[PDB]
Each structure stands twice: as C-alpha cells, then as structure tokens.
Write a protein that binds this ligand. Structure first.
Ligand SMILES: Nc1nc2c(ncn2[C@@H]2O[C@H](COP(=O)(O)OP(=O)(O)O)[C@@H](O)[C@H]2O)c(=O)[nH]1
Lengths: 48, 426
C-alpha cells in the first residue's frame, strides 16, 4: 500500500504570518510667522 | 509696580493660556527663547506684570501651569513658545481626575494642591505689590473645575484683597461633548461666586459662531478658538502693560461694572474682526468698531443680549484715537439703543484708551459687559442639571469619595437664587 503526503496548515500559521511593518517617518514641520515690527508710540512722546 | 500671576488649570486652561503667552510674547517682542528682539522702551518697560527676570535675560512668564494628567502640559512644552515656562512651574500629576468635580476638589486634588500654592506663593511675594490673579480654567471638565475652583478659594483666603480675575469656559448645552457637564458646571459656579471677582463667561459654542459667521473660517480648529480668547485676554490687561491717555487697571473694571456683591459674570467681545478677503474693504474708525462690538454675533458667550439688558458695560479701547470719537460713540449707543440698557443706572458704560495698539492692527476694542442676560445659561445648565438630578443620574461616582447629596441641592439652590437676582433687575 502507498502512503499519501500530508498537506496540513493550522489556521494560526496560515493567517498569522509575520507581516511587513508599516513605513512611518513623517514629521509635521511647522513654520513660525515672523514677529511684526512694533509700530506703537506714547502720546506724551507723540505731541510733547 | 503691578503684578499678575497667571494660573492655568486643566487641558482647556493650559492650551488657552499657552496661546495667551504666545500673543503677549509677540506683543512684548520676546522669542520662544526669551530674549528681546526690538528697539522700544514702551514694549519692555511694563514687563514685570507678566514676566520675571533671571540673570542673563531669559524673561520667564509668571505661569503656574497645573494639571492632574501629564498629557497636555507636555504638549505645551513641545510646541513653539512653550519652553518659556520653568520646568518647576509645571505642577504635574499622575492617574487623573476623569470628568469629576470631586476628583479635583475633595480627593485626588487635595493632595496636589498643597504643591500648587507653593509655586503660587514663590511667584506671589517675589515682588512688591500684586494686582491679582488671572485664572484660566474649564467648568466643563473634572480636573479643570475641581482643583480650578478650589484654588480660587485658596488664593482668596490667602490674599483677600487681590483681584480674582477668572476666564472660564462655561459648558454651553447645545453642541458639546461629555455628559457630566451639568454636574461639573453647577457645582463649580457655587464655589465661583463668593471667591472670584471677575468671572468672564467665554463659551466654546459662541466662539464657533464668531469663527463661522464673522471670520468665515472653513475649518476652525481649537487653536483658532484660543487665539480669539487670548486676544480678549490681552485687551483687558492693556493699561497695566502700556501707557494711554485714559488708563484702566483690572480694579477699575471691578468697581465700574459690579453694582452689587455677587453680579460678576461678564461677556467679552474683541473686534478688529473681518472676513476672509475683507481687509481691503473694512474701515477702522471708532463708529464701525462700536457697531461691531455691540453686534450679538460678536459675543464670546451665546447669551444673546437682546434677550435682556445691559446692567453696566465697559469698552477698553486700544490704538491711537481721539477721545470724543470714543465719547460720542459711547453716548450714541445709549441714546439710540435705550431698551437694552438699564434705567436705574445713568451713563452705563466706561471707556479707556490704550495708546499702544495690538501688533499690526491700527485700532482694537475689547468689550467686557455685565449684562442681565447671562441668566439664560444659568437656566440652561440648571435645566440640564435638574433633568439629570431628579431621576438619580451619574452620582455614585460623585458620592463614594465624599460628597453627600445635600451639596448638590445647595449648589443648585445658589444657582437658582443668582438667577432670581439677575431677574430682579430686568
Ligand atoms: N477653549 C478651549 N476649549 C477646550 C479645549 N479643549 C477642550 N475644550 C472644551 O472643554 C470641554 C472638555 O473639557 P476638558 O478638557 O475635559 O477639561 P479637563 O479635562 O477637566 O481639564 C470640551 O467640551 C471642549 O469643548 C481647548 O484647548 N480650548
């Protein structure tokens, strides 16, 4: 009599295979608005 | 001279005060580093009202940031203009007061608050006088209102003459998250009325109404909302900070707005405000400023003043301007609009003039107003409170740590008689 080969994979090893890791290196670069020049005078200095 | 100690409580208070220290620093010419970057004595001479000095410059804010969850203060630190605060001016806290007034006021807050008044005390008698305390916090939240309003009573009993000026975000009922907003707000207003001097009701919902209708912001984020409030927060402390023809401190505001001992819930509106492409079209004269700050769309509190009167109002102007163009506008709103202004008080408005405008804008207005229309949400949060409290809503997480049921009925009773006190003058 012959001997059939064994085809068998358990479900944990079929669908929990080591997956490729996601590719994450994305910083959120934020600018800074430049500070406006200070246009403001005192009234005492403005007329006196 | 004069000194302000700024304490921020909770996630809302820390994120709304961080933008405040961004807009004050822009006004005083201070980098995220903390060095001056201009040539202006006026921009630097009244700096002790919000900044201390440490050896080689390094103008550190007088900020007492404090929270029971280490999630939002670190976000302030990592952001720009966030290294200005001292590492020991950060009262941390593990676990957390998860949306419970009691977890900030009876347990989990009483242990931390000993260290909080230490940091307050070093930044209180570190100078010569003290005008008062600026306290940004949140009524609609646990760690914000719990140790927030507790601190209000602690620094009142330690300094019972300083101005207790508090910016609070009241929970507006219509479109807002977290379900325990009625229980936090009603319990916190009770502590807020005999312990605070100038409570400024600044709702998130009405700030959204400013963003959608006035500014027409397509996607108003939470930084957009805090930018508006930080602008009003700079406009009220202007005369402690900059010269002017007619000056007005915070103690000016409390005397000339509060007729009777409680009566201290004001409405703010700040207005060089303009649409998206409307900077090329708006004028910036006083009459359009006055016509804008009295518009009900320009309230930070959705407590519509046409559904009420103006008990006493105030407008602290800023920028270069003439005194009569202030005066005739402050008189024309009284003569033309007479129904929404109370009669037993004459001349129901003060005005002040800062000669230093905000950065870029030639002229600006802030409008703090003691109006007898704030009781609309003193009824709104009370109806939300009693609808829950009748058939025994979320209370086992408010009882097992120490409060009894009588504190809830007394908190609603003080809410109710303050509603009746505002309805007295109507
Ligand atoms: N103005 C402002 N309001 C906020 C901010 N974050 C949350 N809120 C509001 O506050 C409510 C939640 O408060 P919460 O953060 O839980 O307070 P806390 O956790 O006790 O400090 C929500 O309804 C929000 O609308 C903020 O950064 N700025």
């Amino acid at each position: 009599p012959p001997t059939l080969p064994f085809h068998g994979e358990s479900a944990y090893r079929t669908d929990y295979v080591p997956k490729p890791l996601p590719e994450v290196a994305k910083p959120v670069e934020v600018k800074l608005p430049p500070t406006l020049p200070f246009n403001a005078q005192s009234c005492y200095r403005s007329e006196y | 001279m004069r000194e302000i100690v700024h304490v921020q409580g909770g996630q809302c208070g820390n994120q709304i005060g961080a933008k405040f220290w961004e807009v004050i620093s822009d006004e005083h010419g201070i980098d995220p580093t903390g060095t001056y970057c201009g040539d202006s004595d006026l921009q630097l001479e009244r700096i002790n009202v919000f900044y201390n000095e440490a050896t080689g410059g390094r103008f550190v804010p007088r900020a007492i940031l404090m929270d029971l969850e280490p999630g939002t203060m670190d976000s302030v630190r990592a952001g720009p203009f966030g290294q200005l605060f001292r590492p020991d001016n950060f009262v941390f806290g593990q676990t957390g007061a998860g949306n419970n007034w009691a977890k900030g006021h009876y347990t989990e807050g009483a242990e931390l608050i000993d260290s909080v008044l230490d940091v307050v005390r070093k930044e209180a008698e570190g100078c010569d006088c003290l005008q008062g305390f600026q306290i940004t916090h949140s009524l609609g939240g646990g760690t914000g209102s719990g140790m927030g309003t507790l601190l209000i009573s602690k620094v009142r009993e330690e300094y019972p003459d300083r101005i207790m000026e508090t910016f609070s975000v009241f929970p507006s009922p219509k479109v807002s998250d977290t379900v325990v907003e009625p229980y936090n707000a009603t319990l916190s207003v009770h502590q807020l009325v005999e312990n605070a001097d100038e409570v400024q009701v600044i709702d998130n919902e009405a700030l959204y109404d400013i963003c959608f209708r006035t500014l027409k912001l397509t996607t108003p984020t939470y930084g957009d909302l805090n930018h508006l409030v930080s602008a009003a927060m700079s406009g009220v402390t202007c005369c402690l900070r900059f010269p002017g023809q007619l000056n007005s401190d915070l103690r000016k505001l409390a005397v000339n707005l509060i007729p009777f001992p409680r009566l201290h819930f004001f409405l703010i509106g700040f207005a060089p405000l303009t649409s998206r492409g409307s900077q090329q079209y708006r004028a910036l004269s006083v009459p359009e400023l006055t016509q804008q700050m009295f518009d009900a769309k320009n309230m930070m509190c959705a407590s519509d003043p046409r559904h009420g009167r103006y008990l006493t109002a105030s407008a602290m102007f800023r920028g270069r301007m003439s005194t009569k163009e202030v005066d005739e506008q402050m008189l024309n709103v009284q003569n033309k609009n007479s129904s929404y202004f109370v009669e037993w008080i004459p001349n129901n408005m003060k005005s002040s003039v800062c000669d230093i405008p905000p950065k870029g804008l030639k002229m600006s207005v802030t409008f703090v107003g003691n109006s007898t229309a704030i009781q609309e949400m003193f009824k709104r949060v009370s109806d939300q409170f009693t609808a829950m409290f009748r058939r025994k809503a979320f209370l086992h997480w408010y009882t097992g740590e120490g409060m009894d049921e009588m504190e809830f009925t007394e908190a609603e009773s003080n809410m109710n008689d303050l509603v009746s006190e505002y309805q007295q003058y109507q």
